[PDB]
Design a protein around this ligand. Structure first.
Ligand code: SR
Ligand code: SR
Ligand code: SR
Ligand code: SR
Length: 137
């Protein structure tokens, strides 16, 4: 019911489809001002049957995947903040060790250091959000 209300904001003229122009109108109302070329890409990504507009079932299918990706992100972020005790955006070896103790795993500095290295792509001796997401895969 809520996705259909979202759809109707896009379908300006009520014909059951969203054209590039109708999507531009909306994006502009949201503070974005994409080119026609950018608008056509956005339509094309959602337009499963290629006829050149987005219809409600196409919209709904995308929105449901966006919902599922959004929820997943929200959850990985929650877990990250659990580890980043002081919330500065990096998990430190001390934070990881502390938190693993509460997860029931009494680890040494060597063992927590080896875990941080596995994930430490950028080599600063800690784990940022990207790096964390990468390990959760
Ligand atoms: Sr329309
Ligand atoms: Sr279509
Ligand atoms: Sr931290
Ligand atoms: Sr790092």
């Amino acid at each position: 019911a809520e996705f259909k209300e979202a759809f109707s904001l896009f379908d300006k003229d009520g014909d059951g489809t969203i054209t590039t122009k109708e999507l531009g109108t909306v994006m502009r109302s949201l503070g974005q001002n994409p080119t026609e070329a950018e608008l056509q890409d956005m339509i094309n990504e959602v337009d499963a049957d290629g006829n050149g507009t987005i219809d409600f079932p196409e919209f709904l299918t995308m929105m449901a995947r966006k919902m599922k990706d959004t929820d997943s992100e929200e959850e990985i972020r929650e877990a990250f903040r659990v580890f980043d005790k002081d919330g500065n955006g990096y998990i430190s070896a001390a934070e990881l060790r502390h938190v693993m103790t509460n997860l029931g795993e009494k680890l040494t500095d060597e063992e927590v250091d080896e875990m941080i290295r596995e994930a430490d792509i950028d080599g600063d001796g800690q784990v940022n959000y990207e790096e964390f997401v990468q390990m959760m895969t």
